[PDB]
Ligand binder design. Structure first.
Ligand SMILES: O=c1cc(O)n([C@@H]2O[C@H](COP(=O)(O)O)[C@@H](O)[C@H]2O)c(=O)[nH]1
Ligand SMILES: O=c1cc(O)n([C@@H]2O[C@H](COP(=O)(O)O)[C@@H](O)[C@H]2O)c(=O)[nH]1
Lengths: 214, 214
């Protein structure tokens, strides 16, 4: 009944990736696999990860193209993954193209709203409330909203009325204690580098999991 | 001294992809390879295509993440590809992270401005002039701007003062005659489905190449 922990597995080597998954599996609740890993290893890594930890695996592919292309990417991705992350800024039709594929396969679609890095302020932040409204309109499964700006995370979550997965804790300077009050059992805190760059990923994953006790 | 032709190779099979490339190589000036093909075949298809047609190969990966992740994606992609397409909407720092990688490797970075599909009007269009100003500021190699809206294509090109690659002709309803007067020899017209879904891609590539005679 606490917020959950999602590992952002952005390593570049299959062996290192599988090793980290094995090490952290008792403490992580889902694995987020992105293009840094997938372009290095191929989509086959997704099924391998899943068989190793028996947890949900989300493909963070930041899908951001026209509907026809989004549909192709979604079909390939969701053969292997349990869900897929899509950008909202490219427009409603592009999001729906991914949703249509995910609905037929019973898979999750997660939409990016405001992002966590400084550049997000330039274009994403001024329309992030409207992205949040769109996520609510489209009934996506969850949204991505930023740990680095707790006030915005709260605001975005309350507009969307959807579960969040939230990145920014650790390497990007976000701190668990500053967002813990905002999150519930249906949310995930995303942690990448703070876990995968450590000499003892098991211990760090355990530390982060226990930090989510609220 | 005419606008050039860039094939959008969004097929899902390696055999079909290589066959199309072989058939159209005398008429196309560059090949754009995206995630539909790469997630299906792996990044290795990029070197294969390059050896097959001896043309520039651009990875249309719509790079749209935080700087650290963008950097990882760029490094992997540009081992193989001659250039990479990045979104501007994620912010200046994210674009620069890709540029920094490409500068070291002497590769091209192409930034998306306004997109060609209806959904682009929702969030991209209202800030596309600012994206164009940012592309100029950042001195990227080219921008993507839409064939489907000739007046916007003209406006965007004149703000950026950069070469464009422009999609939308054919499947999306754009017509060469409507943009030809806007383009010069440093620009590329992107054509995908109208060429790759035809029973005779060679003939269609020829037709499209001849249509660029201006
Ligand atoms: O706004 C966002 C959206 C993301 O998906 N991410 C992703 O979340 C992860 C964060 O990892 P890290 O803890 O190493 O900063 C990365 O995979 C990154 O691409 C992010 O950092 N900010
Ligand atoms: O605004 C844009 C930007 C793109 O990269 N594209 C890409 O250009 C290509 C267009 O192909 P087609 O001619 O089959 O519509 C696709 O690969 C698509 O993802 C686009 O259509 N519109």
């Amino acid at each position: 009944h606490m917020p959950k922990l999602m590992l952002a597995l952005d390593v570049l080597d299959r062996d290192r990736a599988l090793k980290i998954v094995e090490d952290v599996k008792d403490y992580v609740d889902a694995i987020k696999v992105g293009y840094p890993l997938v372009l290095s290893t191929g989509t086959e890594i997704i099924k391998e990860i899943k068989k190793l930890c028996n947890k949900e695996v989300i493909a963070d592919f930041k899908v951001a193209d026209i509907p026809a292309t989004n549909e192709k990417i979604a079909k390939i991705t969701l053969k292997y993954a349990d869900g897929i992350i899509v950008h909202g800024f490219v427009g409603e039709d592009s999001v729906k193209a991914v949703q249509d594929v995910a609905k037929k396969l019973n898979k999750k679609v997660i939409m990016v709203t405001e992002m966590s890095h400084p550049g997000a302020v330039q274009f994403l932040q001024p329309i992030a409330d409207k992205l949040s409204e769109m996520a609510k309109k489209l009934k996506v499964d969850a949204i991505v909203a930023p740990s680095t700006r707790p006030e915005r995370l709260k605001e975005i979550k309350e507009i969307a009325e959807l579960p969040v997965i939230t990145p920014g804790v650790g390497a990007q300077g976000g701190k668990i204690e500053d967002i813990l009050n905002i999150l519930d059992e249906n949310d995930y805190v995303i942690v990448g580098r703070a876990i995968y760059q450590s000499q003892n990923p098991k211990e760090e994953a355990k530390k982060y999991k226990e930090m989510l006790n609220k």
